[PDB]
Amino acid sequence: GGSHMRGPNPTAASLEASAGPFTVRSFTVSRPSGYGAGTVYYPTNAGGTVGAIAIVPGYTATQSSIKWWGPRLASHGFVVITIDTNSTLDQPSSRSDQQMAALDQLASLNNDSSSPIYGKVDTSRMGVMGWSMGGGGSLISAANNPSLKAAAPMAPWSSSTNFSSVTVPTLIFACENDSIAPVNSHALPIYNSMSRNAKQFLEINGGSHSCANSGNSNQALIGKKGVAWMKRFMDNDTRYSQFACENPNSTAVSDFRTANCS
């Protein structure tokens, strides 16, 4: 598909800032199809079509826990939907279905001349993210939909750790002191199961289960890595290779691993 480069050349400082290069606006989805609710964040001035990312919260949680990713990613050139699930008690498989339904709705709104994102989406370039059970659902989405270009589960919770089938580039954020989805029985065995993909594991030092959520104390680092990963793999943009693949050399990181990254 070639590359899909948007925006000025990245620097560490420009990726650690809270606001990327593009102005962002948002709207709530009027008739969500297959999920509970969504807010769509989009760049007004990206200079070309951009890929789409759907983000799912955790069990009992709402969009507030994942909201910060909307403007953070959209401002670098992505259409991002943060969803609420049909019920906040939905399990990971249901969360995956709703995540994929939200991406499909972004593709439909791209066809809709009355939508703010009419013609703004390259619907062939999509990614998945989520927290906790939504991170589990993101891994299910990636396993079931290898056409996805990237995945970034955060403090994932899953009953099964075997994601050996996944071929999608996957960045797993983990939280060192997680007591809800302990790293040793969730994020790390999940990470080790994947032998068929580019992958990365970033464990946040001292982090509780909410360490990648809105209001976290490491938005510079986490946001830099999330954006860099999505830019590298959703846009095929090798200006981001070093940022996506590098050990961040951060006292904020207690464990860093990566494989097959370029």
Q: Which of 65, 96, 115, 132 is catalytic?
A: 132
Rounded least distance, CB 201 to Ca ion, Å: 15
By CB under 5 A, is residue 250 in contact with Ca ion?
Answer: no
Active site residue 255: no
Active site residue 178: yes
In whole angstroms, how close is the CB of 181 to Ca ion at the nearest point? 17
As a whole number of angstroms, the distance between CA 174 and CA 49 comes to 31
Query: CA 141: distance to chain centroid?
Result: 12
Q: Which of 178, 186, 235, 237 is catalytic?
A: 178
Encode 225-257: b = buried (16+ Cβ within 10 Å), e = exposed.
Answer: bbbbbbbbbbbebebbeebbbeebebebbbeee
**Could you tell me the two tokens for 113?**
């001349």
Q: DSSP letter string over 205-216?
A: TT--TTTTSTT-
Single out the residue of 41, 110, 48, 141 nearest to residue 82, CA to CA.
41
Nearest residue (CB) to Ca ion, 203 versus 237:
203
Alpha helices in the chain (DSSP H): 12-16, 69-74, 92-110, 133-144, 187-193, 219-235, 241-245
CA nearest neighbour of 174 among 143, 218, 142, 140: 218
Nearer to Ca ion, 86 or 177 (CB): 177
Q: Which of 209, 210, 235, 237 is catalytic?
A: 209
193 or 205: CB nearest Ca ion: 205
- Residue count, binding to Ca ion (CB under 5 A): 2
For position 254 contacting Ca ion by CB under 5 A, the verdict is yes
Of 205 and 241, CB closest to Ca ion? 205
Comparison of 171 and 204: residue with beta carbon closer to Ca ion: 204
Radius of gyration of the chain (CA): 16
Shortest spacing between CB 184 and Ca ion, in angstroms? 14
Instruction: Report how far residue 107's alpha carbon sits from residue 124's, in angstroms, rounded to the nearest whole number.
Output: 9
Binding to Ca ion by CB under 5 A, coded x per residue (else -) over 187-216, reads ------------------x-----------
Nearest-approach distance from CB 206 to Ca ion, in angstroms: 5
177 sits near Ca ion (criterion: CB under 5 A):
no
Residues making up the chain, counted from first to last: 262
- Report CA-CA distances (Å) from 80 to 75, 77, 106, 202, 235: 10, 9, 9, 22, 14
For residue 130, CA distances in Å to 62, 108, 254 come to: 11, 22, 21
The 29-68 site mask, x for binding Ca ion (CB under 5 A), equals ----------------------------------------
> Which residue lies nearer to Ca ion by CB, 172 or 211?
211
Contact positions vs Ca ion (CB under 5 A): 205, 254
* Residues designated catalytic: 132, 178, 209
